[PDB]
Amino acid sequence: VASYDYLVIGGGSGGLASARRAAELGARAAVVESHKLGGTCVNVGCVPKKVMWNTAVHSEFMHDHADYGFPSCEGKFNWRVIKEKRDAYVSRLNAIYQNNLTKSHIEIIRGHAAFTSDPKPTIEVSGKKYTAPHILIATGGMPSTPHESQIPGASLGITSDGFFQLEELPGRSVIVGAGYIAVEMAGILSALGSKTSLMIRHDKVLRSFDSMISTNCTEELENAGVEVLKFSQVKEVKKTLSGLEVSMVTAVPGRLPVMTMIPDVDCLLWAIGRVPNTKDLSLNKLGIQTDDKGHIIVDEFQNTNVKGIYAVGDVCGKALLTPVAIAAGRKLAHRLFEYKEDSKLDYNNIPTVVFSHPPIGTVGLTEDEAIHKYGIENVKTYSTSFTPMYHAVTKRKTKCVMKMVCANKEEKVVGIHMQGLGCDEMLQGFAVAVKMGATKADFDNTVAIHPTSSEELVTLR
Amino acid sequence: VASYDYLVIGGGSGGLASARRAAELGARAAVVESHKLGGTCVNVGCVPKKVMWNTAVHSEFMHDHADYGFPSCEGKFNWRVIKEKRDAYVSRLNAIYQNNLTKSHIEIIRGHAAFTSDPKPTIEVSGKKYTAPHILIATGGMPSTPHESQIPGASLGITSDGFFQLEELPGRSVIVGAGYIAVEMAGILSALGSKTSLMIRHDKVLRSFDSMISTNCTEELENAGVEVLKFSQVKEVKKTLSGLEVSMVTAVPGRLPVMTMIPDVDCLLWAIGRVPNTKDLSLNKLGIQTDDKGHIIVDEFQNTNVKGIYAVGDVCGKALLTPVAIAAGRKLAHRLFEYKEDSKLDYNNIPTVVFSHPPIGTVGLTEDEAIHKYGIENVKTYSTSFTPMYHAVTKRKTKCVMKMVCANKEEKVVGIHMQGLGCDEMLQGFAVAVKMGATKADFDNTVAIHPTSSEELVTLR
Ligand SMILES: Cc1cc2nc3c(=O)[nH]c(=O)nc-3n(C[C@H](O)[C@H](O)[C@H](O)COP(=O)(O)OP(=O)(O)OC[C@H]3O[C@@H](n4cnc5c(N)ncnc54)[C@H](O)[C@@H]3O)c2cc1C
Ligand SMILES: Cc1cc2nc3c(=O)[nH]c(=O)nc-3n(C[C@H](O)[C@H](O)[C@H](O)COP(=O)(O)OP(=O)(O)OC[C@H]3O[C@@H](n4cnc5c(N)ncnc54)[C@H](O)[C@@H]3O)c2cc1C
Ligand SMILES: NC(=O)C1=CN([C@@H]2O[C@H](COP(=O)(O)OP(=O)(O)OC[C@H]3O[C@@H](n4cnc5c(N)ncnc54)[C@H](OP(=O)(O)O)[C@@H]3O)[C@@H](O)[C@H]2O)C=CC1
Ligand SMILES: NC(=O)C1=CN([C@@H]2O[C@H](COP(=O)(O)OP(=O)(O)OC[C@H]3O[C@@H](n4cnc5c(N)ncnc54)[C@H](OP(=O)(O)O)[C@@H]3O)[C@@H](O)[C@H]2O)C=CC1
């Protein structure tokens, strides 16, 4: 049995960030990875999604070209061109990630790890055993898909993994779900020319976001040509002569339910959540606790129920974002190898951007969460809605909406929510201010930058 | 003589903001304006410049269209199209500004104001007299141009005012100066297809900015096809058969000076600073102090040397930016009509964006200013330079550079400087954090947003 100071199972965002910081602190560390270094972020997530988002953004600016004084463009998009370049960039990052590990003197162990039944926690990979006093599980997640028993033909649909294998633009797309991936993917496909429907169980997308965002985002999808099918769910999927036929039930409250078939569908995309990757770890051999979905249960320091075993990232099922996995991983390394007993990630005030069109930025509490926490007499909100001056000269319009949620007599800024051109790059600095405990006076006494969209946040009344 | 509570001379950014807030507090207020409401910002400054900047940005994205999978566009720009739409938008804002005053019950007095020799401060407009216990001078500035005695033919050149009257794209442009307007205008003209030279007295533009910015911006202009003529100055300008001929002297240190003529110039643009608009006010009749350039001297509360007379904005010659004029104007109104004796604008940590390509954002101290203030053993800087992932798939590249200047053991963040895609909308929230006295720990303990350019500011090492 080979002993290390730190053994990390999974070479994605959280595992790599933790292993790298531990190694800097002198730990002899090893990372086990069964597939590609960089994990979801690099291979089938953040990075290739952002490339496609930039592509979809080009398409929108193509629409405004004539408005801005140029000749209009015909613009038949070639999916194969950008796909090849996107894959090449992913390959470059895979190589960079490997180099980063080698330079940090971290051993890479290739294969699938599972725990053994040995007294002290030990893993096996390809018949060889490894142990350490500290073992991090950072195995991430995978897309959730319906069971064929519940939805016949569900396996004819793809997930976000399959989206990145597509080699041509689907003519007709149906996306099912109402969260991050559904919104981003519908925006990409629609902007690039697919006839796109988004099928959602209720009346709005992103229902866990502030109501102003959920409402505005649903409107913006419609305005961009996405057909939003409300109160609708898939009943069955059949392979026909010319693509898939999707049977759906629409059940609007106060009406009779109605069944419709959607013919000639080229791509059906399930975007209904993620499930943790823990089934094949043999967690039961050590009695590591999981919830009913398979997430590893941790305390505020990322400890599992077993001494010397930790978990970070998507596998724990909380705030499923690349930078959260990285920050939790790094804080854990400082606790273990720098002996900072109080080193942990604060899960409050995590900012997030949804790469819709226009993009959404949010940090902190929604108006409803604030009312629940502080009481309705203690919450004040300020908001504005305007058309960005980019569109002063265009026939196409998008809106910018911004809301600030303040609490108590001082009007501490407890939440900021916005959607609009530029909001993807606008949010980070406001999130620092929110984290520091800014009040509305702190915003108001900062001098504006003009003419920008961002200055509206410091001049709310 | 008609008496008011508050009389504001000039209906630009500072005067309008002050008059509006005073009126909200109950003051009976009047604004005197000789030309168009909205002043420089609306008519010949911020707003029409931003429209042209958005146009120049479209041109850049046209260049990357084929890289992103679309067919390339020929793209002969039509200047007349965007000019007409830009003027129409300006007209809309003029009407909105007028309505805003009427709704606030502020009287508009049309004409040119001058002080009279009356005991108590009194103005005259078109032969009628007005007085108030509080009179704000907010008359702004105008472009500086060389004297014909110093540069023969200088009057053949135009200024930024003239730029907004152009009805066609000049084929060949020479811009003289090395500050904000020179950089922005050269970027606009060059992106839209003019053969553009920028003539500067030293080796870099924006020399009062942090050295990392001055260096990077000069490089980016060159990379974008602007010819930067260093150590060069105009000696004479002559009208020829086919445009202007510009005689210049280039005097590189350590070399012999050399004279060159630039033939066939269509547009020569003087962008060499601004001068205050005070000559025709009859300031001498009350002994209001000015400096040698004509700026009205004020104290930290915007008081002139004469009781009951104040000045804000570009006329005072300090931090010549629209939001500074607005903030100083509003703070003054609260001091006078809400009796907040301590109400004043803090001129430290004012943020600014230069709309170059890519845009620049800066707030706080440059590295040199920090070293001077705190001492060299007390200043630490962190910086990064990277190619934004927008360009991962393009043949054209721009850079993103970011620098954080920290002071003392706590590493208080005393300056942030950056240039790069998106930096125009990124800066405002970091400026709030800087204003609140953030340390580098405050940045580092904010969770990043991925994938963005803005997250690099919270992950510097
Ligand atoms: C389509 C999509 C787009 C997204 N876009 C964004 C975004 O824009 N911004 C953002 O912040 N987040 C985004 N996310 C979420 C983000 O990608 C994840 O939160 C983050 O990647 C999780 O990092 P992790 O370290 O927990 O897991 P992963 O990165 O998934 O790493 C887990 C690694 O463990 C390996 N592994 C699993 N089991 C074993 C085994 N037993 N033995 C050895 N190796 C194993 C896997 O191969 C994988 O490489 C997106 C997610 C998706 C799917
Ligand atoms: C090309 C250019 C681009 C710029 N871009 C930006 C930018 O992007 N962002 C930014 O923050 N700043 C920018 N600025 C600077 C900004 O426009 C000025 O700082 C701001 O407009 C000054 O406001 P003010 O109230 O001091 O003066 P002004 O807006 O100039 O108002 C002065 C008003 O007084 C009137 N007036 C003068 N004398 C009299 C008289 N005696 N009687 C009656 N009325 C009189 C004038 O007609 C004018 O309307 C730009 C400036 C220029 C020239
Ligand atoms: N930009 C970014 O940072 C991105 C981050 N991510 C991360 O990955 C996570 C997972 O993404 P995603 O897959 O979109 O999951 P989400 O959990 O964000 O959303 C899925 C939504 O789909 C709806 N849904 C759930 N079950 C079904 C079903 N059986 N049939 C139809 N609809 C269903 C639910 O909404 P409803 O109740 O309203 O029906 C649910 O909230 C995200 O939450 C995020 O943390 C992913 C993509 C981009
Ligand atoms: N985005 C924004 O907020 C904008 C704001 N503004 C505001 O308006 C102000 C004035 O703009 P601008 O006119 O560019 O003035 P600036 O003062 O910003 O810059 C002019 C520069 O030109 C050079 N210069 C000065 N005299 C001469 C001369 N005789 N011959 C050749 N070069 C000369 C000097 O630099 P050097 O010593 O290196 O030669 C000088 O610093 C700005 O400072 C800014 O406050 C203006 C435009 C955009």
PDB file of C-alpha atoms in Angstrom, chain A residues 42-229:
ATOM      1  CA  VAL A  42     -13.169  22.127 -18.862  1.00  0.00           C
ATOM      2  CA  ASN A  43     -14.716  19.216 -20.787  1.00  0.00           C
ATOM      3  CA  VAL A  44     -18.508  19.443 -20.832  1.00  0.00           C
ATOM      4  CA  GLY A  45     -19.459  22.517 -18.839  1.00  0.00           C
ATOM      5  CA  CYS A  46     -18.352  26.056 -18.208  1.00  0.00           C
ATOM      6  CA  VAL A  47     -15.677  26.471 -20.888  1.00  0.00           C
ATOM      7  CA  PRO A  48     -17.262  24.886 -24.024  1.00  0.00           C
ATOM      8  CA  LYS A  49     -20.569  26.443 -22.975  1.00  0.00           C
ATOM      9  CA  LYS A  50     -18.972  29.919 -22.876  1.00  0.00           C
ATOM     10  CA  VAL A  51     -17.460  29.422 -26.329  1.00  0.00           C
ATOM     11  CA  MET A  52     -20.957  28.607 -27.668  1.00  0.00           C
ATOM     12  CA  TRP A  53     -22.436  31.574 -25.757  1.00  0.00           C
ATOM     13  CA  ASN A  54     -19.909  33.913 -27.444  1.00  0.00           C
ATOM     14  CA  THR A  55     -20.983  32.378 -30.749  1.00  0.00           C
ATOM     15  CA  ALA A  56     -24.663  32.991 -29.984  1.00  0.00           C
ATOM     16  CA  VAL A  57     -23.758  36.611 -29.050  1.00  0.00           C
ATOM     17  CA  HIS A  58     -22.141  37.121 -32.475  1.00  0.00           C
ATOM     18  CA  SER A  59     -25.358  35.998 -34.048  1.00  0.00           C
ATOM     19  CA  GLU A  60     -27.257  38.772 -32.174  1.00  0.00           C
ATOM     20  CA  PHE A  61     -24.874  41.419 -33.282  1.00  0.00           C
ATOM     21  CA  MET A  62     -25.238  40.167 -36.855  1.00  0.00           C
ATOM     22  CA  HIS A  63     -28.952  41.105 -36.476  1.00  0.00           C
ATOM     23  CA  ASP A  64     -28.113  44.718 -35.565  1.00  0.00           C
ATOM     24  CA  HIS A  65     -25.411  45.233 -38.247  1.00  0.00           C
ATOM     25  CA  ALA A  66     -27.580  47.152 -40.707  1.00  0.00           C
ATOM     26  CA  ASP A  67     -28.985  49.327 -37.912  1.00  0.00           C
ATOM     27  CA  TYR A  68     -25.450  50.416 -37.125  1.00  0.00           C
ATOM     28  CA  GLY A  69     -24.646  51.570 -40.665  1.00  0.00           C
ATOM     29  CA  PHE A  70     -23.188  48.441 -42.188  1.00  0.00           C
ATOM     30  CA  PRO A  71     -24.498  46.192 -44.957  1.00  0.00           C
ATOM     31  CA  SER A  72     -26.626  43.313 -43.630  1.00  0.00           C
ATOM     32  CA  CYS A  73     -25.278  39.765 -43.631  1.00  0.00           C
ATOM     33  CA  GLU A  74     -27.038  36.620 -44.851  1.00  0.00           C
ATOM     34  CA  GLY A  75     -25.263  34.548 -42.211  1.00  0.00           C
ATOM     35  CA  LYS A  76     -25.837  30.817 -42.593  1.00  0.00           C
ATOM     36  CA  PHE A  77     -24.001  29.551 -39.473  1.00  0.00           C
ATOM     37  CA  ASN A  78     -21.544  26.686 -39.864  1.00  0.00           C
ATOM     38  CA  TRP A  79     -21.715  24.575 -36.692  1.00  0.00           C
ATOM     39  CA  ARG A  80     -18.791  22.360 -37.707  1.00  0.00           C
ATOM     40  CA  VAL A  81     -16.327  25.265 -37.824  1.00  0.00           C
ATOM     41  CA  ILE A  82     -16.882  26.405 -34.236  1.00  0.00           C
ATOM     42  CA  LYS A  83     -17.221  22.841 -32.979  1.00  0.00           C
ATOM     43  CA  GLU A  84     -13.715  21.926 -34.225  1.00  0.00           C
ATOM     44  CA  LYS A  85     -12.213  25.099 -32.695  1.00  0.00           C
ATOM     45  CA  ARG A  86     -14.081  24.563 -29.403  1.00  0.00           C
ATOM     46  CA  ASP A  87     -12.771  20.992 -29.155  1.00  0.00           C
ATOM     47  CA  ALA A  88      -9.226  22.149 -29.941  1.00  0.00           C
ATOM     48  CA  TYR A  89      -9.403  24.762 -27.124  1.00  0.00           C
ATOM     49  CA  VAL A  90     -10.631  22.077 -24.691  1.00  0.00           C
ATOM     50  CA  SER A  91      -7.637  19.938 -25.748  1.00  0.00           C
ATOM     51  CA  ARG A  92      -5.284  22.832 -25.042  1.00  0.00           C
ATOM     52  CA  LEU A  93      -6.728  23.231 -21.582  1.00  0.00           C
ATOM     53  CA  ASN A  94      -6.478  19.528 -20.867  1.00  0.00           C
ATOM     54  CA  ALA A  95      -2.717  19.787 -21.612  1.00  0.00           C
ATOM     55  CA  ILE A  96      -2.303  22.905 -19.483  1.00  0.00           C
ATOM     56  CA  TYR A  97      -4.066  21.260 -16.529  1.00  0.00           C
ATOM     57  CA  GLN A  98      -1.772  18.231 -16.725  1.00  0.00           C
ATOM     58  CA  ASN A  99       1.297  20.486 -16.837  1.00  0.00           C
ATOM     59  CA  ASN A 100       0.072  22.430 -13.790  1.00  0.00           C
ATOM     60  CA  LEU A 101      -0.059  19.169 -11.803  1.00  0.00           C
ATOM     61  CA  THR A 102       3.356  17.963 -12.930  1.00  0.00           C
ATOM     62  CA  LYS A 103       4.943  21.297 -12.010  1.00  0.00           C
ATOM     63  CA  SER A 104       3.353  21.093  -8.544  1.00  0.00           C
ATOM     64  CA  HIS A 105       4.817  17.583  -8.185  1.00  0.00           C
ATOM     65  CA  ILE A 106       1.393  15.971  -7.775  1.00  0.00           C
ATOM     66  CA  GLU A 107       1.087  12.347  -8.846  1.00  0.00           C
ATOM     67  CA  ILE A 108      -1.698  11.508 -11.244  1.00  0.00           C
ATOM     68  CA  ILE A 109      -3.235   8.093 -10.813  1.00  0.00           C
ATOM     69  CA  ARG A 110      -5.309   7.113 -13.844  1.00  0.00           C
ATOM     70  CA  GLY A 111      -8.342   4.907 -13.311  1.00  0.00           C
ATOM     71  CA  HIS A 112     -11.525   4.521 -11.309  1.00  0.00           C
ATOM     72  CA  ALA A 113     -11.152   4.666  -7.504  1.00  0.00           C
ATOM     73  CA  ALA A 114     -13.299   2.679  -5.057  1.00  0.00           C
ATOM     74  CA  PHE A 115     -12.895   2.267  -1.272  1.00  0.00           C
ATOM     75  CA  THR A 116     -11.891  -1.090   0.177  1.00  0.00           C
ATOM     76  CA  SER A 117     -13.078  -2.721   3.391  1.00  0.00           C
ATOM     77  CA  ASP A 118      -9.720  -2.183   5.121  1.00  0.00           C
ATOM     78  CA  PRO A 119      -9.701  -0.863   8.717  1.00  0.00           C
ATOM     79  CA  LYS A 120      -8.150   2.504   7.866  1.00  0.00           C
ATOM     80  CA  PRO A 121      -9.547   4.252   4.823  1.00  0.00           C
ATOM     81  CA  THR A 122      -7.871   2.831   1.719  1.00  0.00           C
ATOM     82  CA  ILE A 123      -8.758   3.013  -1.977  1.00  0.00           C
ATOM     83  CA  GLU A 124      -8.100   0.642  -4.855  1.00  0.00           C
ATOM     84  CA  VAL A 125      -7.382   1.633  -8.457  1.00  0.00           C
ATOM     85  CA  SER A 126      -6.814  -1.000 -11.114  1.00  0.00           C
ATOM     86  CA  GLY A 127      -5.902  -3.545  -8.422  1.00  0.00           C
ATOM     87  CA  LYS A 128      -3.378  -1.313  -6.597  1.00  0.00           C
ATOM     88  CA  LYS A 129      -3.978   0.158  -3.103  1.00  0.00           C
ATOM     89  CA  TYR A 130      -3.395   3.748  -1.883  1.00  0.00           C
ATOM     90  CA  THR A 131      -3.950   5.306   1.535  1.00  0.00           C
ATOM     91  CA  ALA A 132      -3.504   8.713   3.201  1.00  0.00           C
ATOM     92  CA  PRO A 133      -4.476  10.261   6.561  1.00  0.00           C
ATOM     93  CA  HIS A 134      -6.610  12.722   4.568  1.00  0.00           C
ATOM     94  CA  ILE A 135      -8.705  11.645   1.556  1.00  0.00           C
ATOM     95  CA  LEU A 136     -10.871  14.061  -0.401  1.00  0.00           C
ATOM     96  CA  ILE A 137     -13.829  12.849  -2.448  1.00  0.00           C
ATOM     97  CA  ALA A 138     -14.428  15.348  -5.293  1.00  0.00           C
ATOM     98  CA  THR A 139     -16.099  13.094  -7.870  1.00  0.00           C
ATOM     99  CA  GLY A 140     -18.726  15.585  -9.098  1.00  0.00           C
ATOM    100  CA  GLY A 141     -21.995  14.780 -10.771  1.00  0.00           C
ATOM    101  CA  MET A 142     -23.686  13.769 -14.013  1.00  0.00           C
ATOM    102  CA  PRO A 143     -26.854  14.697 -15.845  1.00  0.00           C
ATOM    103  CA  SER A 144     -30.126  13.354 -14.564  1.00  0.00           C
ATOM    104  CA  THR A 145     -32.388  11.615 -17.105  1.00  0.00           C
ATOM    105  CA  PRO A 146     -35.901  10.153 -16.795  1.00  0.00           C
ATOM    106  CA  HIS A 147     -36.350   6.403 -16.464  1.00  0.00           C
ATOM    107  CA  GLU A 148     -37.829   4.592 -19.476  1.00  0.00           C
ATOM    108  CA  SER A 149     -40.383   3.107 -17.047  1.00  0.00           C
ATOM    109  CA  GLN A 150     -41.697   6.589 -16.265  1.00  0.00           C
ATOM    110  CA  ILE A 151     -41.209   8.152 -19.716  1.00  0.00           C
ATOM    111  CA  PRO A 152     -41.111   5.620 -22.573  1.00  0.00           C
ATOM    112  CA  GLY A 153     -38.528   6.663 -25.152  1.00  0.00           C
ATOM    113  CA  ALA A 154     -36.647   9.000 -22.715  1.00  0.00           C
ATOM    114  CA  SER A 155     -33.312   7.454 -23.809  1.00  0.00           C
ATOM    115  CA  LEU A 156     -33.878   8.954 -27.278  1.00  0.00           C
ATOM    116  CA  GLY A 157     -33.208  12.365 -25.725  1.00  0.00           C
ATOM    117  CA  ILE A 158     -29.752  13.707 -24.965  1.00  0.00           C
ATOM    118  CA  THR A 159     -28.286  15.640 -22.006  1.00  0.00           C
ATOM    119  CA  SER A 160     -25.806  18.493 -21.803  1.00  0.00           C
ATOM    120  CA  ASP A 161     -23.047  15.905 -22.295  1.00  0.00           C
ATOM    121  CA  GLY A 162     -24.603  14.964 -25.662  1.00  0.00           C
ATOM    122  CA  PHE A 163     -24.997  18.625 -26.637  1.00  0.00           C
ATOM    123  CA  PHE A 164     -21.190  18.860 -26.793  1.00  0.00           C
ATOM    124  CA  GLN A 165     -20.945  15.897 -29.119  1.00  0.00           C
ATOM    125  CA  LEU A 166     -23.405  17.373 -31.680  1.00  0.00           C
ATOM    126  CA  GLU A 167     -21.693  17.810 -35.034  1.00  0.00           C
ATOM    127  CA  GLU A 168     -24.438  19.862 -36.736  1.00  0.00           C
ATOM    128  CA  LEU A 169     -27.087  22.369 -35.752  1.00  0.00           C
ATOM    129  CA  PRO A 170     -30.423  20.558 -35.095  1.00  0.00           C
ATOM    130  CA  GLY A 171     -33.215  22.041 -37.212  1.00  0.00           C
ATOM    131  CA  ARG A 172     -35.866  21.579 -34.523  1.00  0.00           C
ATOM    132  CA  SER A 173     -35.023  21.430 -30.806  1.00  0.00           C
ATOM    133  CA  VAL A 174     -37.112  20.717 -27.729  1.00  0.00           C
ATOM    134  CA  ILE A 175     -35.463  21.403 -24.355  1.00  0.00           C
ATOM    135  CA  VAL A 176     -37.057  20.105 -21.192  1.00  0.00           C
ATOM    136  CA  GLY A 177     -36.469  21.796 -17.777  1.00  0.00           C
ATOM    137  CA  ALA A 178     -36.555  25.257 -16.283  1.00  0.00           C
ATOM    138  CA  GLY A 179     -33.142  25.783 -14.646  1.00  0.00           C
ATOM    139  CA  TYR A 180     -29.680  26.995 -15.648  1.00  0.00           C
ATOM    140  CA  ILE A 181     -28.866  24.543 -18.358  1.00  0.00           C
ATOM    141  CA  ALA A 182     -32.308  24.709 -19.981  1.00  0.00           C
ATOM    142  CA  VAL A 183     -32.210  28.495 -20.218  1.00  0.00           C
ATOM    143  CA  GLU A 184     -28.611  28.698 -21.482  1.00  0.00           C
ATOM    144  CA  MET A 185     -29.012  25.930 -24.040  1.00  0.00           C
ATOM    145  CA  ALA A 186     -32.323  27.263 -25.384  1.00  0.00           C
ATOM    146  CA  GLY A 187     -30.710  30.676 -25.805  1.00  0.00           C
ATOM    147  CA  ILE A 188     -27.728  29.207 -27.690  1.00  0.00           C
ATOM    148  CA  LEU A 189     -29.739  26.974 -29.999  1.00  0.00           C
ATOM    149  CA  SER A 190     -32.324  29.589 -30.775  1.00  0.00           C
ATOM    150  CA  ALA A 191     -29.745  32.352 -31.533  1.00  0.00           C
ATOM    151  CA  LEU A 192     -27.863  30.015 -33.923  1.00  0.00           C
ATOM    152  CA  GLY A 193     -31.034  29.247 -35.892  1.00  0.00           C
ATOM    153  CA  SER A 194     -32.665  26.132 -34.440  1.00  0.00           C
ATOM    154  CA  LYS A 195     -36.507  26.274 -34.136  1.00  0.00           C
ATOM    155  CA  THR A 196     -36.534  25.960 -30.401  1.00  0.00           C
ATOM    156  CA  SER A 197     -39.209  25.121 -27.798  1.00  0.00           C
ATOM    157  CA  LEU A 198     -38.539  25.099 -24.032  1.00  0.00           C
ATOM    158  CA  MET A 199     -40.888  22.872 -22.078  1.00  0.00           C
ATOM    159  CA  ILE A 200     -41.429  23.821 -18.421  1.00  0.00           C
ATOM    160  CA  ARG A 201     -43.606  22.386 -15.630  1.00  0.00           C
ATOM    161  CA  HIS A 202     -44.882  25.739 -14.346  1.00  0.00           C
ATOM    162  CA  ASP A 203     -45.272  29.227 -15.795  1.00  0.00           C
ATOM    163  CA  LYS A 204     -41.740  30.659 -15.434  1.00  0.00           C
ATOM    164  CA  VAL A 205     -38.119  29.641 -15.611  1.00  0.00           C
ATOM    165  CA  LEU A 206     -35.595  29.954 -12.811  1.00  0.00           C
ATOM    166  CA  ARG A 207     -38.269  29.883 -10.127  1.00  0.00           C
ATOM    167  CA  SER A 208     -35.718  29.819  -7.270  1.00  0.00           C
ATOM    168  CA  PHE A 209     -34.421  33.229  -8.402  1.00  0.00           C
ATOM    169  CA  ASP A 210     -35.903  36.550  -7.397  1.00  0.00           C
ATOM    170  CA  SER A 211     -39.376  36.920  -8.937  1.00  0.00           C
ATOM    171  CA  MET A 212     -38.269  39.937 -10.957  1.00  0.00           C
ATOM    172  CA  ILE A 213     -35.639  37.775 -12.622  1.00  0.00           C
ATOM    173  CA  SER A 214     -37.841  34.724 -13.191  1.00  0.00           C
ATOM    174  CA  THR A 215     -40.489  36.915 -14.852  1.00  0.00           C
ATOM    175  CA  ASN A 216     -38.105  38.981 -16.943  1.00  0.00           C
ATOM    176  CA  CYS A 217     -36.064  35.992 -18.129  1.00  0.00           C
ATOM    177  CA  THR A 218     -39.202  34.146 -19.285  1.00  0.00           C
ATOM    178  CA  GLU A 219     -40.274  37.249 -21.271  1.00  0.00           C
ATOM    179  CA  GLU A 220     -36.822  37.695 -22.818  1.00  0.00           C
ATOM    180  CA  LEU A 221     -36.768  34.072 -24.009  1.00  0.00           C
ATOM    181  CA  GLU A 222     -40.118  34.608 -25.764  1.00  0.00           C
ATOM    182  CA  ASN A 223     -38.960  37.888 -27.277  1.00  0.00           C
ATOM    183  CA  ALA A 224     -35.865  36.130 -28.658  1.00  0.00           C
ATOM    184  CA  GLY A 225     -38.070  33.545 -30.455  1.00  0.00           C
ATOM    185  CA  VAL A 226     -37.955  30.639 -27.996  1.00  0.00           C
ATOM    186  CA  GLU A 227     -41.367  28.993 -27.756  1.00  0.00           C
ATOM    187  CA  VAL A 228     -42.034  28.558 -24.055  1.00  0.00           C
ATOM    188  CA  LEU A 229     -44.484  25.686 -23.428  1.00  0.00           C
TER     189      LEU A 229
END
